[PDB]
Amino acid sequence: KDELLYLNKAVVFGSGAFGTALAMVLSKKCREVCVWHMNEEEVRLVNEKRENVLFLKGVQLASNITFTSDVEKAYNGAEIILFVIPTQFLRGFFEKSGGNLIAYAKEKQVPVLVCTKGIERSTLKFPAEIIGEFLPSPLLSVLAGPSFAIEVATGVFTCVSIASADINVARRLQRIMSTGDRSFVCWATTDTVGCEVASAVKNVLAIGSGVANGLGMGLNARAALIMRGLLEIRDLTAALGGDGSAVFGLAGLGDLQLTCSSELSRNFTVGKKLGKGLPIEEIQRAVAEGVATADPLMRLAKQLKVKMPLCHQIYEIVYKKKNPRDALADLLSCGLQDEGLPPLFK
Amino acid sequence: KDELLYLNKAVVFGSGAFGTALAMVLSKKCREVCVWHMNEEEVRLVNEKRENVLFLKGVQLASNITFTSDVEKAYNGAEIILFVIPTQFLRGFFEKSGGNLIAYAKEKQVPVLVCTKGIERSTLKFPAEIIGEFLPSPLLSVLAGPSFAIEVATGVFTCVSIASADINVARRLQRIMSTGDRSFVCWATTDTVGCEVASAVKNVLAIGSGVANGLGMGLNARAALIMRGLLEIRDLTAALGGDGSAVFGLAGLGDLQLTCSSELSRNFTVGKKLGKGLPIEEIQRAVAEGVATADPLMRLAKQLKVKMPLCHQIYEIVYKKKNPRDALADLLSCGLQDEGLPPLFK
Ligand SMILES: CCCCCCCCCCCCCCC
Ligand SMILES: CCCCCCCCCCCCCCC
Ligand SMILES: Fc1nc(Cl)c2nc[nH]c2n1
Ligand SMILES: Fc1nc(Cl)c2nc[nH]c2n1
């Protein structure tokens, strides 16, 4: 059924740019939308100026969006729950404040949409997997795709995929998240692993994109990094048991090419400074997702015996003061090779 | 063998930007490089100013690159032949001036590299297929990948794929085209059809990218157009008997994302003006490859019963004065769907 679903209430845990942007999306499909933010003082401010001046300045929030520091009131009555809490705080949130939330979600069978991205350092697990330790899979879906927050928040045409092991679960969330004016369109897929992998790895690759630019390279190089980088996402996805159908879709190449072409992003800028010879210490003044993700990514890759040429070199440049130019030469020391892509048709 | 091959002579038929750029690449692997250009008066000019002021202004040609209007002297002694002659002139060139050239190529078993891109209107065939009517396949390879001419001509890091039904043929051309400083790296593949399809369709899609921009959309939209557009390249490739291994590689998504992000390209500008409501007649002052390719592409698609949503709508906007906004709505009238990508791993 391509018929949309409207709800009475939606709750979004995570007040970042993406989370706020998604709250704007939901304000067009849900009579009420609550956005949980821990700092009460800042919550009042946001509700007063009707604008998330903290992480989405310049965008006026719909009048039916209300920020709150009260976890209980936040999810109370919600018919869909979105998690956009940073990876490092995810587990702690559930242990310290998710008790009743979890019970409610299970009791009322409320759909949960995972929008958090990254890799937990202690377990090398992805967001949806972490959340899966507290909530059952039947209620878990992941949202991923080329979706700059500003564009999503202001209703500029955007496409994303919704992933769930059970495609029917994804299709229902697809009916909830897709907007009436077709400005936010969702596509269903089963590849939850591919989505989480791509969402994490793209940030590391984006730093490599920055490096290439700071190294004097142009757009041909960026296109090659994206194409060869996507294969690393594919290989890691396979090793993690993912079906891989999201790799060459919106969450995979779609989001990857977008993220690697965002020259003003912190991942890019950090990479550019690294390509220009600046030491990481000096650059650190700004925590780019790519920097934080590179270590656990490398450890997970090693643990699974997955070779990730680009990501490995990016880790060396960022963590082992490796000279960008030398890293590049090492990458190319492999010699002439075949593109390494299987045929699609026999 | 990852060991490079150097030659005494190389000839490039086609003096355009890409052809000249490739001549620069060859000047680093071939003692002598001839570039055929029909107009003798212009040939003398280029050789005097040692610069292709006609299609690659600003780039000084290597001293071992010589332009010429003499087809015979051009290929005489060449150990590799590149064709970059525009599609519409390809067949006529072989009929009127390729007689001895063809004989020589067959006699000496000289490798031929097809760099021309497009669709011949009269036969709806691709460049390598057209050339295949005069020369045997064993000697035919195709070059495709994200490769802006200026960057290639000046040695800025670039990656491309070399396609040949017989992978061993591609691997040898890969040893010839790849440069000693690893600034131009070639990857071998068998998907000649996918490469030719992607190279032609990308220009039509680039116009759609322009439309999206002139329509007020942002980068999320562009990323979605690239991802969904790639599927049209895939489907058409399948229908033409291609193995498809190039679709998600350098010649496919690599070149596509690059071509769709070139905001200053004619395909983009034409698309932008169309998205802004300007009639094609008014815009035409500049023949964008996308405009010329859209008609034969649509006719070939219809002939093979291949649905190409984006390319079809772009054809309507360009040839049938269809309102960009209406085209967009028609594209989205399909309703909620699954992403439609098969799993890569079982
Ligand atoms: C980290 C610097 C940016 C690199 C520029 C892109 C180069 C892409 C080529 C990758 C080839 C990898 C060889 C496979 C082992
Ligand atoms: C031609 C205008 C540009 C369109 C902007 C990109 C939209 C991509 C969505 C395509 C969906 C196609 C539905 C499949 C039939
Ligand atoms: F952001 C953010 N979110 C949550 Cl949930 C937190 N818990 C402790 N610090 C935290 N910071
Ligand atoms: F460009 C270009 N190339 C060739 Cl080969 C031609 N033959 C006739 N006009 C032509 N224009």
From Swiss-Prot, chains A, B:
Chief location: other
Broad EC category: oxidoreductase
Active-site residues, record numbering mapped to chain: K202 (proton acceptor)
Enzyme Commission numbers on file: 1.1.1.8
Residues annotated to bind substrate: K117, R266, N267
Molecular function via GO: glycerol-3-phosphate dehydrogenase (NAD+) activity; NAD binding
GO biological process entries: carbohydrate metabolic process; glycerol-3-phosphate catabolic process
SUPFAM superfamilies: 6-phosphogluconate dehydrogenase C-terminal domain-like, NAD(P)-binding Rossmann-fold domains
Compartment(s) of residence: Glycosome
Family named by the database record: Belongs to the NAD-dependent glycerol-3-phosphate dehydrogenase family.
Name of the protein: Glycerol-3-phosphate dehydrogenase [NAD(+)], glycosomal
Species assigned in the record: Leishmania mexicana
Taxonomy of the source species: Eukaryota, Discoba, Euglenozoa, Kinetoplastea, Metakinetoplastina
